[PDB]
Amino acid sequence: TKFLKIKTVSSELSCREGQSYWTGSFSPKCLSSRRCHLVGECHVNRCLSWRDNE
Amino acid sequence: EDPHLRNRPGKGHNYIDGMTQEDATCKPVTYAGACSSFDVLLEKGKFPLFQSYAHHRTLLEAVHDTIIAKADPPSCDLQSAHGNPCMKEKLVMKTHCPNDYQSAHYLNNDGKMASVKCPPKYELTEDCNFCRQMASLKKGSYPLQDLFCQSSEDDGSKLKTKMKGVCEVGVQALKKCDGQLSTAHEVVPFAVFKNSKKVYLDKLDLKTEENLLPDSFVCFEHKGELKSFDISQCPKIGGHGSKKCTGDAAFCSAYECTAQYANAYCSHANGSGIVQIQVSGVWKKPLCVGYERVVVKRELS
């Protein structure tokens, strides 16, 4: 005689996950650098039109 | 836009007290000469901070101008006794010094200055933490930190490291550690005031405040182009002087201009003057502000 018992805990309703993402709180830390006009890279045309990925 | 990166105000001395070997080519430091402690400061891809702020002074010039003091000993020899104070502050630093260099100066913790020394013929390595054996060997020193000197006398000895969540950064034993402490080499800002400790930073707010100062004008000698010429020989407004001098509105507003009746052309340096700092919400004036890559111990847990 060989028994094969399957224990049942309870009846649960699991939630099927689909789209997920990691998020949280963030506080930006700004760094100022006031450069004079015609001093290295500080200009009237290159200070205005400045790219964010450079 | 002025290519006056070689003209040094004040006096123009870059050789340090302790390795006076290259004093025959860097005295005075001008457009000529091949000083090993100034050529790497303008190369593209090394110290861009000094490239942006080059019309002021350096740490060596600050030492020669009685601004930054020197530790005891100022040049700790690496091959002498068994223990020297200039080692715990050197092993924690991670830099990259080129080959064919004998000495390597850096900033200490007590606000003074302490460098190393290797007897001939020893050269540095890829990191500079130890001098091994052997173009020719340069008889100078390599700047280990990206900082710049300036003329200032602002007092600030009542300030310490302003870093939160940091166990022991560099050699400073701040707070204790009870959990997981990091050790990754990360860049950290710092600013040492007059007669103070190696005060670190967290938020930097640089600015440009120019002023009519004698150590803020550059010029080159004219002759039958960039030539060396001393600025101290420029007459004042109706005063006296040896030779002649001339310039624009900035140079002629404080000095005497003779137009074509001179031997040089003094021009106002871009950005030279007074560079202040904003620490703890109070505007201050540092001495040798810069960056360094030391061992930062951050408490993660």
Side-chain angles (χ1 to χ4, degrees), chain A residues 1-14 16-29 31-35 37-41 43-46 48-54, chain B residues 1-25 27-34 36-75 77-85 87-96 98-117 119-127 129-130 132-148 150-166 168-176 178-218 220-233 235-244 246-251 253-256 258-265 267-287 289-301:
Chain A
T1 300
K2 298 299 293 295
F3 62 94
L4 185 63
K5 293 186 286 184
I6 293 88
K7 187 182 287 184
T8 301
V9 178
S10 66
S11 66
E12 294 178 353
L13 278 78
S14 179
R16 185 175 179 179
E17 294 179 354
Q19 188 62 255
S20 179
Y21 65 95
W22 285 91
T23 187
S25 67
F26 293 98
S27 181
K29 299 294 187 291
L31 276 75
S32 67
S33 179
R34 183 179 64 84
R35 187 64 60 85
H37 191 270
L38 288 173
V39 179
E41 294 292 328
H43 297 285
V44 69
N45 55 3
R46 292 200 293 175
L48 294 175
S49 66
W50 186 256
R51 292 183 292 173
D52 293 331
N53 55 3
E54 183 180 1
Chain B
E1 291 178 351
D2 292 331
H4 294 285
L5 297 175
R6 297 293 299 273
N7 205 166
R8 306 302 299 163
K11 187 68 174 67
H13 289 171
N14 288 318
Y15 57 90
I16 222 31
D17 288 330
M19 295 301 291
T20 59
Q21 294 298 112
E22 63 181 2
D23 55 355
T25 61
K27 182 176 172 66
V29 175
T30 177
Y31 179 73
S36 66
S37 296
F38 186 76
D39 288 331
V40 296
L41 293 173
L42 294 174
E43 292 179 353
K44 298 292 184 182
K46 298 292 179 68
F47 287 164
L49 179 60
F50 184 76
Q51 294 178 357
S52 296
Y53 289 163
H55 296 282
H56 294 89
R57 286 181 174 90
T58 62
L59 184 62
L60 282 80
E61 292 181 354
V63 171
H64 189 273
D65 289 331
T66 67
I67 299 178
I68 300 300
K70 297 182 290 294
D72 292 331
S75 66
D77 194 1
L78 295 174
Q79 295 297 110
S80 294
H82 293 88
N84 49 0
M87 189 59 223
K88 299 292 183 182
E89 296 171 351
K90 181 69 175 68
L91 192 143
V92 297
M93 293 180 183
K94 182 64 70 177
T95 61
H96 293 286
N99 296 115
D100 291 331
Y101 283 105
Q102 184 177 2
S103 179
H105 65 278
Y106 60 93
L107 185 63
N108 57 2
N109 198 4
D110 291 330
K112 296 178 181 179
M113 183 174 175
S115 66
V116 298
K117 182 174 73 175
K121 293 180 181 179
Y122 289 164
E123 66 182 1
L124 294 175
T125 62
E126 292 85 3
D127 56 355
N129 288 318
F130 60 96
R132 66 181 180 179
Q133 293 179 357
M134 187 136 195
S136 66
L137 295 174
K138 297 291 180 68
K139 299 283 103 175
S141 178
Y142 179 74
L144 295 173
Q145 293 179 356
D146 192 0
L147 79 160
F148 63 95
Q150 65 183 357
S151 179
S152 176
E153 291 180 353
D154 195 0
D155 186 74
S157 66
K158 299 295 187 291
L159 293 175
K160 201 61 70 68
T161 298
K162 298 294 289 183
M163 294 179 73
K164 292 187 286 185
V166 176
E168 293 179 354
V169 53
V171 296
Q172 294 179 356
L174 295 174
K175 66 183 290 294
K176 301 295 187 291
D178 291 330
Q180 183 66 41
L181 277 76
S182 66
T183 185
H185 294 89
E186 293 179 353
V187 291
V188 286
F190 64 93
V192 177
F193 288 163
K194 181 64 70 177
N195 290 318
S196 66
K197 296 292 289 183
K198 185 171 71 175
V199 174
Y200 287 97
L201 296 172
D202 195 2
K203 185 177 179 180
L204 59 150
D205 289 327
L206 292 174
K207 69 180 178 67
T208 300
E209 184 178 1
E210 294 178 353
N211 193 0
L212 292 174
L213 293 174
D215 292 331
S216 296
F217 293 98
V218 297
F220 58 94
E221 185 177 1
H222 283 87
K223 62 175 68 65
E225 293 86 4
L226 294 173
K227 302 294 183 182
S228 179
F229 185 75
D230 195 1
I231 199 180
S232 66
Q233 294 179 356
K236 300 297 294 295
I237 303 299
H240 298 284
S242 66
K243 292 177 71 68
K244 299 293 183 182
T246 189
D248 54 355
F251 187 78
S253 179
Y255 290 163
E256 183 178 1
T258 59
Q260 70 272 15
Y261 298 101
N263 296 114
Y265 181 75
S267 66
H268 189 274
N270 45 355
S272 179
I274 296 179
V275 176
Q276 293 180 357
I277 199 178
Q278 183 178 2
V279 57
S280 178
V282 176
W283 287 99
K284 300 295 287 183
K285 189 174 181 180
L287 294 175
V289 59
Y291 289 166
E292 66 182 1
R293 188 169 66 188
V294 298
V295 176
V296 177
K297 292 181 181 179
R298 292 182 184 271
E299 183 178 1
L300 294 174
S301 54

